[PDB]
Design an enzyme around this catalytic site. Structure first.
Site, mmCIF file in Angstrom:
data_model
loop_
_atom_site.group_PDB
_atom_site.id
_atom_site.type_symbol
_atom_site.label_atom_id
_atom_site.label_comp_id
_atom_site.label_asym_id
_atom_site.label_seq_id
_atom_site.Cartn_x
_atom_site.Cartn_y
_atom_site.Cartn_z
ATOM 1 N N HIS A 115 3.187 5.783 -3.734
ATOM 2 C CA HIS A 115 3.650 5.021 -2.538
ATOM 3 C C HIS A 115 4.766 5.752 -1.776
ATOM 4 C CE1 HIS A 115 1.457 1.647 -4.580
ATOM 5 N NE2 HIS A 115 1.020 1.523 -3.289
ATOM 6 N N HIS A 167 3.975 0.818 6.540
ATOM 7 C CA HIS A 167 3.501 -0.368 5.780
ATOM 8 C C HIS A 167 3.994 -0.372 4.322
ATOM 9 C CE1 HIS A 167 0.606 2.306 4.051
ATOM 10 N NE2 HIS A 167 0.341 1.394 3.150
ATOM 11 N N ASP A 168 4.502 0.738 3.783
ATOM 12 C CA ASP A 168 5.080 0.773 2.397
ATOM 13 C C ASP A 168 6.540 1.260 2.400
ATOM 14 O OD1 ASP A 168 3.120 -0.236 0.574
ATOM 15 O OD2 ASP A 168 2.088 1.645 0.603
ATOM 16 N N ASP A 197 -5.507 1.389 3.729
ATOM 17 C CA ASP A 197 -4.636 1.451 2.533
ATOM 18 C C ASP A 197 -5.407 1.966 1.326
ATOM 19 O OD1 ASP A 197 -2.202 1.156 1.202
ATOM 20 O OD2 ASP A 197 -2.483 -1.069 1.095
HETATM 21 MG MG LIG Z 1 1.893 -1.697 -0.165
HETATM 22 ZN ZN LIG Z 2 -0.044 1.374 0.969
#
Ligand SMILES: [Mg+2]
Ligand SMILES: [Zn+2]
Ligand SMILES: Cc1cnc(C)n2nc(CCc3nc(N4CCC[C@@H]4C(F)(F)F)nn3C)nc12
Length: 313
Positions: free
Chosen positions: A68, A106-107, A217
């Site tokens: 991530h 988004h992360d 994702d």
């Molecule tokens: Mg995530």
């Molecule tokens: Zn992600």
């Protein structure tokens, strides 16, 4: 504004394909992103100086974790780019602006741990955000960076357009909570099969953009097999570190996160492709036919995991 970003020939051609891998040269990833904004949105969308400052603060706020991390952000943004470029006329100007930013953000500030681990550890974030804990955090980090001086890339939008883009981003980032995906996909499946799906219905678009977010994702399963297989090593490196942290709290981890079950990874991938990935790309392809190459690549990778189980690889 006569200043286009340009990529070497192999990258200029391959970046258009869904299965593109952004490469091991970290310093090229910001230029790859600006290239994708300029083609999917335009050279007019953002001031180059503000966009460059925003990207660099976003990068600085991803952590040095196995999966991530900043490379994951840019990888997820590229899959969105390929979706947007293959569906030229389905998306609004605000949606093109918001969705690549949402993917890059988004992360933000991921620590390599699941929502479930933060709740069991009793992390402060789990009291601030009782569901979609990390995803509410990622959206809050995005707003923070948008509010730094010289970082407001949306400054030329009206108040109401700015509110709209921040709402596209918020919903897109929340939708990356995989716990929410199963339900979203089932409603989209029914809506498509009973022909009630209406892309002029805002709550329907929101569902379709959510599924696009899940698809981007999960896009490691849509790559060439060597990429897929080596990305899986990074994915499990995180899970197994979380497993170790579960055992430190005196809790048996789920099998996914127990490094003692290393041997079952091939069978774990089959379950994941059949329960999560294949359904994701199948429903996406029904709604957005030109995304079919994602489904085809996913099915090729499922067949490779099947080969691993038969010891043919
Ligand atoms: Mg995530
Ligand atoms: Zn992600
Ligand atoms: C979110 C995500 C994104 N992208 C990818 C490619 N993955 N892979 C996953 C893991 C999937 C998974 N592996 C296992 N295994 C592995 C061995 C033990 C256990 C089982 F017993 F099943 F074999 N269980 N589960 C559910 N999760 C994702």
């Amino acid at each position: 504004g006569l200043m286009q970003f340009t990529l070497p020939v192999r990258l200029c051609k391959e970046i258009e394909l869904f299965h593109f891998d952004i490469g091991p040269f970290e310093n090229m990833w910001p230029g790859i992103f600006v290239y994708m904004v300029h083609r999917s949105c335009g050279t007019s969308c953002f001031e180059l100086e503000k966009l460059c400052r925003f990207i660099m603060s976003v990068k600085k706020n991803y952590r040095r974790v196995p999966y991530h991390n900043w490379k994951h952000a840019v990888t997820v943004a590229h899959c969105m780019y390929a979706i947007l470029q293959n569906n030229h006329t389905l998306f609004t100007d605000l949606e093109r602006k918001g969705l690549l930013i949402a993917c890059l953000c988004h992360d933000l500030d991921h620590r390599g741990f699941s929502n479930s681990y933060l709740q069991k550890f009793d992390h402060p974030l789990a009291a601030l955000y009782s569901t979609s804990t990390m995803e509410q955090h990622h959206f809050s980090q995005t707003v923070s960076i948008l509010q730094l001086e010289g970082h407001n890339i949306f400054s030329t939008l009206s108040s109401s357009e700015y509110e709209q883009v921040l709402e596209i981003i918020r919903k897109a980032i929340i939708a990356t909570d995989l716990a929410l995906y199963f339900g979203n996909r089932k409603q989209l499946e029914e809506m498509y099969q009973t022909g009630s799906l209406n892309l002029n219905n805002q709550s329907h678009r929101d569902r379709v953009i959510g599924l696009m977010m899940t698809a981007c994702d999960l896009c490691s399963v849509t790559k060439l097999w060597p990429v897929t297989k080596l990305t899986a090593n990074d994915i499990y490196a995180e899970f197994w570190a979380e497993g170790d942290e579960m055992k430190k709290l005196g809790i048996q981890p789920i099998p996914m996160m127990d490094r003692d079950k290393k041997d079952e990874v091939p069978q774990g991938q089959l379950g994941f492709y059949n329960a999560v990935a294949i359904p994701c790309y199948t429903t996406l392809t029904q709604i957005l036919p030109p995304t079919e190459p994602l489904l085809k690549a996913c099915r090729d990778n499922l067949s490779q995991w099947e080969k691993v189980i038969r010891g043919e690889e």
